[PDB]
Amino acid sequence: VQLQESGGGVVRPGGSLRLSCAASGFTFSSYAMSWVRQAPGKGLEWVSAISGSGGSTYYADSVKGRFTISRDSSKNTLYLQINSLRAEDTALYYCAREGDYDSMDVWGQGTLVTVSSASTKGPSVFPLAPSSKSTSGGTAALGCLVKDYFPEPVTVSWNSGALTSGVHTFPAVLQSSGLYSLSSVVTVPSSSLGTQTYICNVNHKPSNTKVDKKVEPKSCDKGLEVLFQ
Amino acid sequence: SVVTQPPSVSVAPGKTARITCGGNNIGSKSVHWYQQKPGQAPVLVVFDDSARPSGIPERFSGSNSGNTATLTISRVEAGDEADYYCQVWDNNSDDVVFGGGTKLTVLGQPKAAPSVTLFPPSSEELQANKATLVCLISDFYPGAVTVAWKADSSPVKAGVETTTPSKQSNNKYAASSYLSLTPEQWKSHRSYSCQVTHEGSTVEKTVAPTE
């Protein structure tokens, strides 16, 4: 028994997409089928189900009137037509075969839907500077904020791959702007801050952009202050 | 019907894990349980309260009565670490209700409270007419936290994004939370705070525009 979803990708808010799920290894028309979605880092959300014959359809309130479930027994295929797409429709879309009491005994691997108005865009890279506020017990945290890029992914290194110990690069968040942001941090000795250079190396292959940002300790010298801060 | 699962449960290997699914008169409904490992589809482990699909270990057992359904995993093993979801069927409605999920941690290392570093908006970002507060949360275990933000003394929900905890190279967890402000909002409060809840302790870091 297998299910394989397809049709996901990047789409604009107010746009339309058709998802497909190819079924095999069972008598397709004997089973109700469901679409269940999952936003990255979030829980399962049931979207829609359909009886064996297609004679009954069922929808979550959140999608009533924007989504249409259908099936074609000759092609052993389930569909989901998603219209008037919203930011909140960004998720991995699973098809599942139901059994007794709508238990879902077989799942596909899912197809990813990303709802964004964004075009390809390289990141802005801002320093997360160490001062007495990230210096706790002789060590200092410093990083890079990698803001407003599209699409995924970016990769980050430190001192051109020389610095690895204490390095953590976070997963990205899709902001309400339709753009991604992530951070990279390293913990270093406070005594190194005077003498060792720290550079984050950001690579965004989709836009053919790389950025090297030098991350320097905050100078609290009022004689060096600028006006738009 | 809202169904309530605890966000996280930690158990030592060999001990018994109990994951609950709470709802008014859930005992009158049928409850299924799913296991989801990261990067994988859910797997049905219990259906109709207490039945086990073939190939699921006997250590997985379900019960359901009153206002509580429970998935009980006896002799828990490292490989049982997963997110667990309950699903409620009702003969008299159509909708599929899932609980919010429970992260099961199988404890193979000591519990560790988070280090919290709160970065104010950089001079460069403020020059660009934007302001992000970055709350970096590090070296914690188990890998489950809640983050809340304050402007002075008041809670702030708008402009918050939080990542799912990620394993560090030293096998503890890290997470990140962002509060997106305008430069005006930044400079208009005396202070901002990031509050991190772990294992029912809260660590709060504060920054002030004027320091």
Place this chain on the structure above:
Amino acid sequence: RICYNHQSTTRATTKSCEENSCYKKYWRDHRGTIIERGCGCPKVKPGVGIHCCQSDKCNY
């Protein structure tokens, strides 16, 4: 004892039961009305249909 054990409206099949009642159980899921047949007289959830009978082949 001898009881039907076929699901919904699939082809009739029967089975030998060391119990004295048979059962027909029926409920609604996304497929529609579903029927289970077997040995015994089980408890069911409220709203679910259950017919238990003492004869043979009574749970048709």
